[PDB]
Amino acid sequence: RLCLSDYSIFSETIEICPEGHNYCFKKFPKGITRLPWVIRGCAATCPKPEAQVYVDCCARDKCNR
Amino acid sequence: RLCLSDYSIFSETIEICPEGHNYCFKKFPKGITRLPWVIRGCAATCPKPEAQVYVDCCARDKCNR
């Protein structure tokens, strides 16, 4: 499985997932619009979210944008 | 298309991409901070990544920094 590490304009950073990891996730904060941190990577299971955080979880190549 | 071959301070090494190659890429390892190798060049398609490697893939002149 291939996930994105970063995504912008069209600049995407691509990684190949470890064995058994077939999910791509994206983590971002809930009340931030003024240039928020965003976290991406591979996962064996959809990451559980934290207090003020959403996690996108998807299962296709380079899906977490 | 023009891609970077090397980039630093402000010293950039510039190349002109072959016909049909309109992507610039950048390849770098995943757990290395202590002066890592970095690979840059032109591409017809975004290079697939390797085990412990990220590949940036972008589509503008001299975009892979």
Author numbering:
A (entry chain A), B (entry chain A): 1 to 65
Reproduce text from the manuscript describing this model:
Ringhalexin exhibited a mixed-type inhibition to FX activation by the extrinsic tenase complex and also exhibited a weak, irreversible, neurotoxicity on chick biventer cervicis muscle (CBCM) preparations. Ringhalexin, like other 3FTxs, has three β-stranded loops extending from a central core containing four conserved disulfide bonds which resembles the three outstretched fingers of a hand. Thus, ringhalexin exhibits mixed-type inhibition of FX activation by extrinsic tenase complex.
There were three protein molecules in an asymmetric unit with each molecule consisting of residues from Arg1 to Ala65. All the three monomers are well defined in the electron density map. The model was refined to a final R value of 0.22 (Rfree = 0.27). Each monomer of the asymmetric unit consists of 6 anti-parallel β-strands (β2↓β1↑β4↓β3↑β6↓β5↑) that form two β-sheets. The fold of ringhalexin is maintained by four disulfide bonds, and these cysteines are strictly conserved among the 3FTxs. The electrostatic surface representation shows that the molecule is predominantly positively charged with few negative patches in the surface. As shown in the case of other 3FTxs, the loop II of ringhalexin was very flexible and some of the residues showed very high B values. This flexibility suggests the possible role of loop II residues in the function of ringhalexin.
